[PDB]
């Protein structure tokens, strides 16, 4: 007795911050080796 | 922080009164919040 | 104006070296600071540093000095 | 209830040291002091905290606070109890010792004040020497900034009485010479009496009026009696 | 105003008392103020 | 402006939603309004 088709759904929170002003990460779904630098991303916002 | 059982944290600060109106900037302004929320409180508290 | 920021974990462990750091910024002439820990006889001297114009961050070592129990302490 | 329950270890103390005592006065004491133990306890906030009404937001009560950690402290000795929730009280008290100049800062609105006439110093004075009567060491900076406060607050002024429970508070640490710059002019305020000599309150304010509502004369002067017993009770070094 | 006595104003020798009442940072809506002669020595006595 | 059975008064805007929640600065705020006020359309109408 489900839809009739794929659907999924999700429920999330949101954050605060007062004058608004944000970062965030760029996940990664990889182990990073021993001894290699590596550069993971960041992203950021920031507020008047 | 509850470590062993051991609290740690620092007592929540005074409320505010939820009747008193605000003007700023079009109409009269009176707060309102969700009870779960994220901060930098949340987002730590979870490292520690 | 001066603001810090002081960064330690809550759950120190027995007799092996740790890390604390604080991040000074905001001021502009020399200043002083001092950084220590309550052990329920002595007091540590984690970072007692003269300070030189703004933008200290600063992180260091020190040792904790063994106790047979578990106990919450200050920092100051 | 807790008020109540604290003269009992002392008498059986008292009992004890005076060598008139029997078992089944002891016993009977245990089962009550055994009451008392699980009866107040209950009450404790989550912080620690311990406050005469019953809603957890609502806290305070600092005295009566430091009240339960002293007296079931003096209970220890003669059962066992938590040393944990003894440290947990120390957290939430210690939340009130956040001024560096001011030392510590008192709250008092209950349904029965104390005799101090309000003044953060003498309650933060009472803190103290409940403090140091404590299982542990000098190494508590609690020591380090209630005894600058007080050595602030010393040749500065204040009344008779707070300098009276300073007098112990030296004598317990052996400071011993505040000890005796103190102890003249807290001598010099005897009164002679008929073959005998104590320390009357003074009473500059009259009776009760619309601000004026506990009469503290004869407790107040039984406990400054009382301090005086306890310091001059051990000299530095002499005794005769 | 509300509950707090203000004025505490001397009059000019004909009873023609004047006040200058600031009104910056207010956002109240109701403001019923009240005047009021207080003195423990007039012959007057409590009637209606 | 009601005259000799003439109305000769334009109708009033439209009204607003109770239930729009705005954030300006910090708080999160609600609209409310009071019926008793005074707008220059009411210091005028007594005119004519």
Same mark, same amino acid.
């Given at each position: 007795?489900?839809?009739?088709?794929?659907?999924?759904?999700?429920?999330?929170?949101?954050?605060?911050?007062?004058?608004?002003?944000?970062?965030?990460?760029?996940?990664?779904?990889?182990?990073?080796?021993?001894?290699?630098?590596?550069?993971?991303?960041?992203?950021?916002?920031?507020?008047? | 922080?509850?470590? $062993?059982?051991?609290? %740690?944290?620092?007592?929540?600060?005074?409320?505010? @009164?939820?009747?008193?109106?605000?003007?700023?900037? $079009?109409?009269?302004? %009176?707060?309102?919040?969700?009870?779960?929320?994220? @901060?930098?409180?949340?987002?730590?508290?979870?490292? $520690? | 104006?001066?603001?810090?920021?002081?960064?330690?974990?809550?759950?120190?462990?027995?007799?092996?070296?740790?890390?604390?750091?604080?991040?000074?910024?905001?001021?502009?002439?020399?200043?002083?600071?001092?950084?220590?820990?309550?052990?329920?006889?002595?007091?540590?001297?984690?970072?007692?540093?003269?300070?030189?114009?703004?933008?200290?961050?600063?992180?260091?070592?020190?040792?904790?000095?063994?106790?047979?129990?578990?106990?919450?302490?200050?920092?100051? | 209830?807790?008020?109540?329950?604290?003269?009992?270890?002392?008498?059986?103390?008292?009992?004890?040291?005076?060598?008139?005592?029997?078992?089944?006065?002891?016993?009977?004491?245990?089962?009550?002091?055994?009451?008392?133990?699980?009866?107040?306890?209950?009450?404790?906030?989550?912080?620690?905290?311990?406050?005469?009404?019953?809603?957890?937001?609502?806290?305070?009560?600092?005295?009566?606070?430091?009240?339960?950690?002293?007296?079931?402290?003096?209970?220890?000795?003669?059962?066992?109890?938590?040393?944990?929730?003894?440290?947990?009280?120390?957290?939430?008290?210690?939340?009130?010792?956040?001024?560096?100049?001011?030392?510590?800062?008192?709250?008092?609105?209950?349904?029965?004040?104390?005799?101090?006439?309000?003044?953060?110093?003498?309650?933060?004075?009472?803190?103290?020497?409940?403090?140091?009567?404590?299982?542990?060491?000098?190494?508590?900076?609690?020591?380090?900034?209630?005894?600058?406060?007080?050595?602030?607050?010393?040749?500065?002024?204040?009344?008779?009485?707070?300098?009276?429970?300073?007098?112990?508070?030296?004598?317990?640490?052996?400071?011993?010479?505040?000890?005796?710059?103190?102890?003249?002019?807290?001598?010099?305020?005897?009164?002679?009496?008929?073959?005998?000599?104590?320390?009357?309150?003074?009473?500059?304010?009259?009776?009760?009026?619309?601000?004026?509502?506990?009469?503290?004369?004869?407790?107040?002067?039984?406990?400054?009696?009382?301090?005086?017993?306890?310091?001059?009770?051990?000299?530095?070094?002499?005794?005769? | 105003?509300?509950?707090?006595?203000?004025?505490?104003?001397?009059?000019?020798?004909?009873?023609?008392?004047?006040?200058?009442?600031?009104?910056?940072?207010?956002?109240?809506?109701?403001?019923?103020?009240?005047?009021?002669?207080?003195?423990?020595?007039?012959?007057?006595?409590?009637?209606?």
């Amino acid at each position: 007795e489900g839809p009739d088709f794929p659907t999924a759904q999700h429920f999330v929170m949101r954050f605060y911050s007062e004058t608004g002003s944000f970062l965030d990460i760029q996940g990664s779904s990889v182990e990073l080796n021993c001894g290699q630098v590596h550069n993971i991303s960041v992203r950021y916002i920031l507020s008047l | 922080y509850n470590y $062993g059982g051991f609290n %740690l944290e620092e007592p929540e600060p005074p409320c505010e @009164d939820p009747n008193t109106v605000i003007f700023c900037k $079009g109409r009269y302004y %009176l707060p309102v919040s969700s009870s779960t929320e994220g @901060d930098t409180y949340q987002n730590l508290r979870r490292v $520690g | 104006k001066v603001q810090y920021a002081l960064t330690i974990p809550a759950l120190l462990k027995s007799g092996e070296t740790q890390r604390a750091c604080v991040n000074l910024i905001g001021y502009h002439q020399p200043l002083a600071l001092s950084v220590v820990l309550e052990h329920q006889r002595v007091n540590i001297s984690i970072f007692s540093e003269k300070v030189q114009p703004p933008h200290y961050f600063k992180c260091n070592k020190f040792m904790v000095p063994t106790v047979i129990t578990n106990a919450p302490d200050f920092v100051t | 209830n807790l008020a109540r329950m604290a003269p009992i270890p002392y008498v059986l103390e008292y009992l004890n040291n005076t060598n008139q005592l029997t078992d089944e006065l002891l016993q009977t004491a245990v089962q009550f002091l055994n009451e008392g133990y699980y009866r107040q306890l209950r009450y404790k906030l989550p912080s620690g905290a311990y406050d005469a009404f019953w809603s957890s937001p609502s806290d305070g009560s600092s005295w009566l606070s430091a009240y339960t950690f002293k007296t079931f402290e003096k209970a220890k000795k003669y059962i066992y109890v938590d040393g944990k929730i003894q440290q947990q009280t120390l957290l939430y008290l210690q939340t009130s010792q956040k001024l560096d100049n001011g030392c510590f800062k008192a709250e008092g609105n209950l349904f029965m004040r104390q005799c101090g006439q309000e003044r953060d110093l003498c309650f933060t004075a009472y803190l103290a020497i409940a403090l140091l009567e404590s299982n542990y060491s000098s190494g508590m900076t609690l020591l380090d900034d209630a005894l600058g406060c007080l050595e602030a607050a010393m040749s500065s002024a204040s009344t008779l009485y707070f300098k009276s429970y300073t007098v112990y508070v030296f004598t317990l640490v052996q400071n011993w010479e505040i000890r005796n710059t103190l102890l003249n002019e807290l001598k010099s305020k005897v009164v002679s009496e008929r073959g005998t000599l104590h320390w009357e309150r003074e009473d500059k304010l009259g009776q009760e009026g619309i601000p004026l509502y506990y009469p503290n004369y004869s407790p107040a002067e039984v406990e400054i009696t009382a301090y005086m017993l306890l310091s001059i009770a051990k000299g530095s070094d002499p005794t005769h | 105003l509300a509950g707090k006595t203000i004025g505490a104003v001397l009059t000019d020798k004909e009873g023609r008392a004047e006040y200058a009442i600031d009104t910056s940072s207010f956002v109240q809506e109701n403001f019923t103020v009240v005047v009021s002669y207080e003195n423990p020595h007039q012959c007057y006595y409590t009637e209606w």
